[PDB]
Design a protein around this ligand. Structure first.
Ligand SMILES: Cc1cn([C@H]2C[C@H](OP(=O)(O)O)[C@@H](COP(=O)(O)O)O2)c(=O)[nH]c1=O
Ligand SMILES: [Ca+2]
Length: 129
């Protein structure tokens, strides 16, 4: 896999971000995680966490996996990095997202995220409290 440039257009919620990619605006849904919706417990805190990450970073990047690059809703499907930190791993490590939506062609970083989730679960963080 490889990282590609993108620029923040705007943070949306815990696991969706609008980015400019190859000069075109698109909504990206983070691969391999599920954050609560904003109206659910820990949703605002997830949305806040992701917003800070992607806004504060000097450099946001996208990384497609090996399978589908867009979902049925036209959202891009990628891992997102903020100054080289994977947004998925940060959220999961903090108990603000669960590993989820692990589909067969697009699961390169599953075990990294599962490891992070196990540590969050151990610490009883947020969603696991
Ligand atoms: C993360 C991800 C979600 N999706 C689809 C499955 C779910 O469809 P349904 O809407 O049909 O439940 C939906 C969940 O996204 P949200 O968690 O953003 O709602 O997005 C994929 O198709 N591929 C993926 O990699
Ligand atoms: Ca969600």
């Amino acid at each position: 896999l490889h990282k590609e440039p993108a620029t923040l257009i705007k943070a949306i919620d815990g696991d969706t971000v609008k980015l400019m990619y190859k000069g075109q605006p698109m909504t990206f849904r983070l691969l391999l995680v599920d954050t609560p919706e904003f109206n659910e417990k820990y949703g605002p805190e997830a949305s806040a966490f992701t917003k800070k990450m992607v806004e504060n970073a000097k450099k946001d990047e996208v990384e497609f996996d090996k399978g589908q690059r867009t979902d049925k809703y036209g959202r891009g499907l990628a891992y997102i990095y903020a100054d080289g930190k994977m947004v998925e791993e940060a959220l999961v490590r903090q108990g603000l997202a669960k590993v989820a939506y692990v589909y067969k062609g697009n699961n390169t970083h599953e075990q990294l995220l599962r490891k992070a989730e196990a540590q969050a679960k151990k610490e009883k963080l947020n969603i696991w409290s």
